Write a protein that binds this DNA or RNA. Structure first.
Ligand SMILES: Nc1ncnc2c1ncn2[C@@H]1O[C@H](COP(=O)(O)OP(=O)(O)OP(O)(O)=S)[C@@H](O)[C@H]1O
Ligand SMILES: Nc1ncnc2c1ncn2[C@@H]1O[C@H](COP(=O)(O)OP(=O)(O)O)[C@@H](O)[C@H]1O
Ligand SMILES: Nc1ncnc2c1ncn2[C@@H]1O[C@H](COP(=O)(O)OP(=O)(O)O)[C@@H](O)[C@H]1O
Ligand SMILES: [Mg+2]
Ligand SMILES: [Mg+2]
Ligand SMILES: [Mg+2]
Ligand SMILES: [Mg+2]
Lengths: 312, 48, 309, 313, 312, 312, 312
DNA sequence: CTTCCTCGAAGGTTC
DNA sequence: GAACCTTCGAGGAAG
């Protein structure tokens, strides 16, 4: 299967993985439910994949839903009240729940009970509905969008980190065995170093290289085919796309490296201001090719030697 | 007297009451001989 | 039990706790009901816990509901009809009651009667003496005429290190865990002044001691557990340390804008502003300025860099 | 009870109180009802109580309701049928009445009769309803939102105003005698100074002081006990709460008086944006301690000399 | 019809056509659905046209809808229930969809399932909907408005480029045949040079010249007729408007080439400050007539020779 | 009723009244409807009264409504459909009606017809309704807030203005006689001076002064009584009201005479800026109590000496 | 009615008429509709009338609506569903249309189809509506305010300008012929001089002058009578309005001649910014009363001598 | 009714 | 003093 199922198969995330192991083992010695867990961090690092692994290691059934599908308290109350002892409730994109619904979970998470209105007219009554022990697991990209009293109730916090070349190369090799393809250890490293640190991007590059190898090649991925395929996609050995290279080149040849404003640079590449700041500039800054200053953007020494100019 | 009965029903509707409930409210008045003014006046007095 | 039941158990909150004792004792001496009390303040300081203490000190049975559940006047009217003389009604998250429900609550508090219209028919009720207790985090969201009717206002405050040290020891005995006095102190420094955070750290440290040790907490095991959780001696998280380091090493302490800093740490702008900055500004590690924010002298000494004016 | 019942006891509001007496007597010197009256003022000044006193001085029954309770014209016309000649109709929150009813009320006030039109329009007929004379009394917190045609029908206007220390002190003296406690005039003046001019607040402070004076003392409110009570409660001698002092102190010490944004101030004191904007900031503006500007809040010279800090432009 | 129907008719976009061909061929050999593809770039370059070409080459029927037509989750769920195995869904102007609905696609694109709430309301439960294999095609002008988790799920990215004079000349000639008009090869090149590298503009000018040539002429677009019609429309031989000529002339006559600030120039031309910067200045920079600098903007040598003044 | 019914009875407004006479009589000679008329100015000057006089001079039925009273096109269509040839429609506060209503008024006023769509989905229809000759009379307090395309449809304009002591003394005397009240030429001159140049206030004061004379006097309005009665009503000797006195006193005590903005002032005293700007500031400016400056309003020396504050 | 109906009757706008004649005639040889046309320029110059003339020349019906009237997509669909083959749809103030509504026209204009969700609940479904051929006509004050993808779809652009004194004189002579009246050439020229080169204003003043000449004169319009009638109105001896006098007075007295921004000015005269930007500022500039600078508008010495101040 | 976001301000640098 | 650029704060209208 494409998604790992146990901690043996889950590569990387040593900090989060090592922590979860200790908490799972201690919970089993006490024969009690696991504490509530919140998983957050950048897109595509394995948040959803981890939520399933947690259920398998605990050996219990996993019930799944999503924030967008819950629209009113009546819906949530119907998901609850159907839970059995030790069940795990997983909610993806939990930040989309209406704030009027989040405030129902406040009592459920701390005391395992909820308030309900029942009856009609003079017969109406309010009673406590008592829930069995359970573990709520949430995954989100926008943790700052949750209410302050809700974040305070999660007992375990997992913040995901980017991967490194050794771990990504192993992921590429594993995926290359789900498909029925041979890949030379040198070719795998060449794709891993261009995947910007993210497993989803590594899998995407492999799929595209495969289509080439079986149309313009003999059906095997080797050092010769990888170089040709990556040249067609036009991805630099640092992962810089065609437009990424054009940005750095223009800063060096017309503005002498800057400083230059975002408006001035956008017009010279025919790109609109809102795409440059949200798609291309973020990775260039995080990798040290560009520096932001009060005067404008400036190219670093690292950018000069990568493009081949002289740092005069 | 049917004209006064219809008038009172329509006048009560002209006050914002629903046609069904207005018919019942005016129909609930006993004396038919009283004028439309009294019929509407009595219906409103009873609705308090 | 994790929730204290009497004032002799409720640690801290000397200001609010001292006032409540005077008013409760006076109410008993006159055989009157307690005045309406509103509790408000930051999350996790004891607002819900205090409401249950007040009920036991008065010697009454507490009726409990919540704002999100009460959706229409008919709901509230039914709840109020179950009150007996001297009863206490507690409404949690009172800021969520619809405006229509709040209007009905005005006269119930001032004149102890309800006269409302609700196939519709009239209802008139004349209520016995009762005490309303409300708890909220967003007291600014209540209507101005409603706030004017509460008689006792209790504003909660953060705890000091000697108070939290005692709270940790109390919880340790419930779990029958053995902990040394200096180990309890090392958790207090990191608990940010909040009881819920102090209990959370203890639960995590217990799990470590039962798997990587002999199930006993000492000054040595605590250091290992806190190193795995990666919580600084000032209570800063891994991301909090990364923010300060970036500001000092890339911008000379600032000024720097929020957007620039967020992109440099690969975080969503809203997460830095709402989840991490509040504690840094309150402790005095960062200042906000017309042109950006800057790291203060305290940040340099803590992180270990040479300060230059 | 804590509500005065006659002009004999309604303390303060002398300007409005004096005018009403002359008009009410002139109405008695004729077989006429009083003109329609509208009361203006901030919340908690006694608007409701004044309506009841008007009815007693007139010696006529009073009907109580609020604008939101009148949802259709039939309700108003039905209520009007329950009135006897000369009865007073009191409608609170008159600014919240629905538009569809407002346009009909004009005829009742000026004409005391109503006409209703029915039929498709090609054939149509009216009904005429004659009403007993009455006087409408409206109470509202906001005058400007009342439409000009409605405003023209009200023949008497009465501004309520904040009570001054010489009058608010007497309310404390009076209330202290409904309970069983003796209170020294000096102590009563210390409570009045901190009551922000609102009777509801002065009553609330006195209740708390009474609790202290009978638990931490001999059951007498003397000036010494009053100081200790006003020390457990953190109410400043200018009426500032604990948090009001913390806001001003923060602005002066860390921002040099500003300008500073609402969001930056909120995170410094650890409070919610809504709470600072609606609970504390409104009273600080009336006293003139701060001002709102295009660039944020700013502290005034009045705040510097009150907190005791040197000033610099 | 004006719109091409197959890759053999789609002139230009050599880089985009080459990639799509390889991926479409590999998909057919495996007999599988094509990966999700996102088309983006400047207005009028041929995005909506290419979406139909992909469907014709794959040999499937196309289901079509638009971003603004979808307003709530109940709309999208209804559409997805109609997809058959191998169907292609095309969503134009995808950046307009609301965030509440955009987050529903996350599961459908990765795992082909949706979570829905069902039951009368007294009794209700969450259940999976399982979708057959399908290909989503999206077209957008403002890729930066899409959330990061959505862009990460598209497997093929197509960035459109402006057309060169040789290619744009062929489009003018092909269109003339559809209008049953006769055009001299020298006239086709005159229009192509004025079409700002954009196929829509080239078609608009041709349509106007065609109408003119049959009202005051003999029904043939000769080299002499073309000059008269283009003079009526006031289109310079570089594609400049009269407003653009006014800008360039002012800088040479009143400032000797600059530098000059944008605020000062706007007043001297009686044009709106922001209109000049957003509507006219972008093309003048891209063509090399004006150059921005830290002290202001300057007219280049190309602007002198085009106006006939003496460069110094 | 107190309001006059004919131009012979309408005192003052010589400018507006003289123009309307010419246009009203000329329309009779041609036997046709009067052009649309817009009346604007401070409240209480006689805008409503004037509309009734025009209707009586024309000999036509008058229909009345208000801006806030109309919520949807169907409401206005009913009113318009009930018109009879020559009827006058009077709309008060025409500046407050919704944008969706104004859509229909353009077509009606310009060509006397409307086009209302009806039906939905498979049902869709539009009714072309011809309207008989009619005249619209509009009134507003704010002229600059009226929609520009609407303001162009009005053919006659009437700018109302404040009354002088000779006219107000005649009005005060007239009104007293209707009540059969006896007032000497001396007391009537006091009320006119102290009634802010406005007939509505003058009539409002007279009813209150009557009550005082009926108790604190012998039913005869003496000059000595009028002064004591007006002072008891808190009406200044210059006619300034409670709000007027509070404005100037707040400027002198809290802002050293200003300058201060309209919003800031209206927030300190619990008053609406629309009220202060409509009823109070215009009067205070014409009489020199307030002056306008680039920084805001400033109190003149006259205000200082009247209020009894030593000038700086 | 006064509205012209054929190009022979439409005086002026020679440039626009000359171009439209060619395109309208060419579109009749072929049996097809005219391309989408865009008209822009100051208000009241006669672009609505131009839409009627085009429809009369084409021999089809004209439907009329406006930008602000189309609040939501379901409104526009109903309008489109009611067009007959070859009809003309005129949308006034198209720039003020909601953004999400504009995005629907993109398909209707370019391909004559729209994709719409119809029904509710389980009946929710997508239907591909096919539209008959039609011609859209848009009118707007600002060209640089439409979006780039909308502006790029209009095939014909028309710019309109103020009429010269010889043209307005003939328009007055025509209008004074529909009314059975007699006017001497001196009065016609004198009246046109006041009308700001705008036919709408000319017709309004002519009607008022006619009423005066019928009541206060011998029924004949002469230069002596025209001065008297115009002096009784607020029209200045060179066409300045009372609003213009208000503007110039404020600039000279309250700001010291300027420079001043229109944002602060608009709030001091209590006028909607759009009115001064569109209706007043353009005329005051095009006649030398106001001068523009980097910082804002400034009053010229010509203004000082007109208002009676000293240009020290 | 609430979130979002864009209009207008002013602080700082270079030439 | 002229021209660019970054950052913030309070409105206000589009879900
Ligand atoms: N003149 C007064 N003398 C004594 N007590 C007064 C006086 N005015 C008000 N009070 C007290 O103030 C309390 C509240 O008065 P209210 O009539 O509610 O004022 P209010 O204007 O109605 O406030 P609202 O209606 O809630 S905005 C009363 O119960 C009295 O005890
Ligand atoms: N010229 C006048 N002659 C007689 N009475 C007048 C005159 N102007 C105003 N009034 C009186 O004052 C009041 C004016 O009210 P109204 O005409 O509605 O003013 P507005 O319409 O401007 O609010 C009426 O009572 C009216 O009789
Ligand atoms: N060239 C012209 N000849 C005769 N009358 C004209 C001419 N241009 C405009 N008009 C008249 O002047 C008025 C212009 O109104 P309209 O065409 O609606 O202007 P807009 O559409 O810009 O508001 C109409 O009464 C119209 O008949
Ligand atoms: Mg996921
Ligand atoms: Mg709680
Ligand atoms: Mg009250
Ligand atoms: Mg397209």
């Amino acid at each position: 299967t494409l998604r790992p199922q146990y901690f043996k198969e889950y590569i990387g995330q040593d900090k989060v993985k090592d922590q979860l192991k200790i908490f799972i083992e201690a919970a089993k010695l006490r024969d009690e439910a696991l504490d509530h867990t919140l998983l957050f961090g950048p897109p595509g690092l394995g948040k959803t994949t981890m939520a399933f692994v947690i259920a398998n290691e605990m050996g219990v059934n996993l019930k799944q839903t999503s924030g967008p599908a819950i629209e009113k308290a009546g819906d949530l109350v119907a998901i609850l009240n159907d839970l059995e002892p030790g069940d795990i409730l997983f909610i993806d994109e939990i930040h989309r729940m209406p704030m009027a619904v989040e405030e129902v979970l406040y009592s459920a998470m701390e005391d395992y009970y909820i308030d309900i209105m029942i009856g009609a007219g003079e017969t109406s009554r309010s009673v406590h509905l008592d829930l069995p022990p359970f573990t709520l697991v949430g995954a989100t990209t926008r943790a700052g969008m949750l209410s302050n009293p809700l974040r305070a109730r999660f007992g375990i916090n997992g913040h995901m980190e980017y991967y490194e070349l050794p771990d990504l190369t192993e992921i590429v090799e594993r995926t290359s065995e789900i498909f029925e393809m041979t890949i030379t250890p040198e070719a795998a490293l060449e794709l891993a170093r261009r995947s910007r640190g993210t497993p989803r991007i590594a899998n995407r590059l492999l799929k595209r290289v495969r289509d080439y190898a079986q149309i313009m090649g003999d059906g095997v991925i080797d050092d010769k085919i990888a170089d040709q395929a990556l040249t067609m996609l036009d991805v630099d050995h640092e992962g810089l796309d065609y437009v990424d290279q054009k940005i750095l080149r223009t800063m060096i040849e017309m503005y002498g490296g800057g400083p230059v404003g975002l408006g001035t640079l956008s017009v010279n590449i025919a790109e609109e201001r809102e795409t440059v700041e949200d798609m291309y500039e973020p990775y260039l800054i995080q990798k040290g090719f560009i520096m932001r200053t009060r005067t404008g953007r400036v190219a670093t020494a690292k950018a000069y030697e990568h493009m081949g100019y002289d740092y005069t | 007297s049917e004209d006064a009965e219809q008038e009172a029903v329509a006048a009560l509707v002209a006050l914002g009451y629903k046609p069904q409930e207005a018919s019942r409210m005016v129909s609930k008045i006993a004396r038919p001989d009283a004028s439309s003014e009294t019929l509407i006046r009595d219906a409103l007095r009873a609705a308090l």
